[PDB]
């Protein structure tokens, strides 16, 4: 139960308009073979160029849909479209190019998929709603064979190149021709009842069908996300560390702590509504206030509906106190609130794009975030930068520049002169902060809220 067996049976009914003829009965071992690619017998890593569906989760940041339309089928020039929103026609002899020999097109396909790729995955896995060109048009794109390591670095190699006979991974691959030991997965043997867009458009309004390969490349991949992470939900599956994860999460953290301990204090609320994860601690340990949680695992469908969260007939009253919505994502947030809500529209090598305006935010475990939506906040405001602290004004144990700022809530700054080790706390706050905005994150809070409140929490 490790990798896809290659003598699994590959429904071919998807198959039949492009390849009339086909046999019903097929492995994925005939399948390999009638793409022009020879297995040989290898125990070296690559078991079979399919994979399930448990591996293309594990490997969502390698998909890329793919889909080749005939134009005119080594007499017809073929349309090669990709999720990235590119259309290559090959010649025999929504950006579209003109038709172009093969051994030019695949130099282009090697750069388009390094450049998408080599800071997501060590792979790619081509998604795929096969009818038959796509599978038939490989063999002049793609080689195969045993698991190989990079000419210039460790990582495993992604391409090939036959006017060098070397391989690359997707970072040192400039000037490779070829794909080599890619992956793919045919949506079509999920087992689904009409075409592509019947079966997309039922969970995406986002993607229209504009009638191109690339079109359809990305209703394919989108509709797998659907599958694998809307209407199914994995949170145990773990994803490898490619980027800043760590430090974002950490910054996460510690903005919470400085929001809801500012919070508790300028307002002093006598209650607080946690809303959101069932495995939530305390941001604020040592807060006066009521802390009252309520269960809300993170929605990846379409946003909560405040009244099937609230309603129904729990301190009940929702009104009393404030309402933190740490990266719970509400229809429309209640006056009362704190506010963390991830933007889907960040470009960013952990978000991934997803189905129907919503993304996949990738960060250790793989969360589909519905669409950002403005009007979920018309009853609060964009939450101010500001670093609040009462810790003692003391160094302790990085050379220093006098710190100037209005937003530096502390006691040595309503005295007049910032200390040095505030300044220092204040700047790493604010990195931790940008690190948080940038990553995609928009805070949020009550209309009152003002941090001149703070001021006279030192006396
Ligand atoms: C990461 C990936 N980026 N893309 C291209 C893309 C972008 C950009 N916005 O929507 C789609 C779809 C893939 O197909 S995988
Ligand atoms: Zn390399
Ligand atoms: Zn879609
Ligand atoms: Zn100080």
Same mark, same amino acid.
């Given at each position: 139960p490790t990798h896809l067996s290659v003598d699994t049976k590959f429904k071919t009914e998807g198959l039949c308009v492009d390849i009339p003829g086909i046999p019903k009965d097929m492995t994925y071992r005939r399948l390999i073979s009638m793409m *022009?690619?020879?297995?040989?017998?290898?125990?070296? *890593?690559?078991?079979?160029m399919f994979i399930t569906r448990e591996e293309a989760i594990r490997h969502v940041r390698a998909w890329i849909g793919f889909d080749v339309e005939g134009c005119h089928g080594t007499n017809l020039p073929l349309q090669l479209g990709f999720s990235t929103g590119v259309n290559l026609v090959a010649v025999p002899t929504p950006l579209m190019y003109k038709g172009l020999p093969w051994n030019v097109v695949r130099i282009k396909i090697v750069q388009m998929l390094s450049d998408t790729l080599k800071n997501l995955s060590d792979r790619v896995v081509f998604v795929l709603w096969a009818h038959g060109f796509e599978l038939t048009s490989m063999k002049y794109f793609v080689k195969i064979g045993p698991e190989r390591t990079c000419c210039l670095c460790d990582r495993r190699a992604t391409c090939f190149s036959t006017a060098s006979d070397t391989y690359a991974c997707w970072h040192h691959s400039i000037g490779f021709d070829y794909v080599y030991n890619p992956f793919m997965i045919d949506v079509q043997q999920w087992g689904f009842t009409g075409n592509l867009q019947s079966n997309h458009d039922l969970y995406c309004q986002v993607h229209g069908n504009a009638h191109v390969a690339s079109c359809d490349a990305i209703m394919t991949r989108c509709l797998a996300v659907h599958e694998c992470f809307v209407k199914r939900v994995d949170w145990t599956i773990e994803y490898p560390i490619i980027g800043d994860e760590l430090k974002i999460n950490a910054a996460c953290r510690k903005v919470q702590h400085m929001v809801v301990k500012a919070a508790l204090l300028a307002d002093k609320f006598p209650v607080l509504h946690d809303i959101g994860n069932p495995k939530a601690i305390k941001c604020v340990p040592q807060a006066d206030v009521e802390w009252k949680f309520y269960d809300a695992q993170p929605c990846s469908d379409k946003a909560y509906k405040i009244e099937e969260l609230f309603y129904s007939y729990h301190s009940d009253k929702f009104t009393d106190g404030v309402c933190l919505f740490?990266?719970?994502?509400?229809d429309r947030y209640p006056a009362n609130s704190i506010v963390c809500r991830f933007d889907t529209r960040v470009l960013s090598n952990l978000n991934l794009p997803g189905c129907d305006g919503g993304s996949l935010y990738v960060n250790k475990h793989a969360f589909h975030t519905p669409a950002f939506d403005k009007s979920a906040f018309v009853n609060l405001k964009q939450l101010p930068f500001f670093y609040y602290s009462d810790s003692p004004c003391e160094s302790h144990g990085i050379d220093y520049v006098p710190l100037k700022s209005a937003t530096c809530i502390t006691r040595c700054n309503l005295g007049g002169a910032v200390c040095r080790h505030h300044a220092n706390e204040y700047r790493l706050y604010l990195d931790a902060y940008n690190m948080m905005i940038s990553a995609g994150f928009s805070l949020w809070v009550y209309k009152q809220f003002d941090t001149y409140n703070l001021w006279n929490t030192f006396t």
């Open positions: *022009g690619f020879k297995m040989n017998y290898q125990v070296n *890593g690559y078991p079979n740490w990266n719970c994502n509400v």
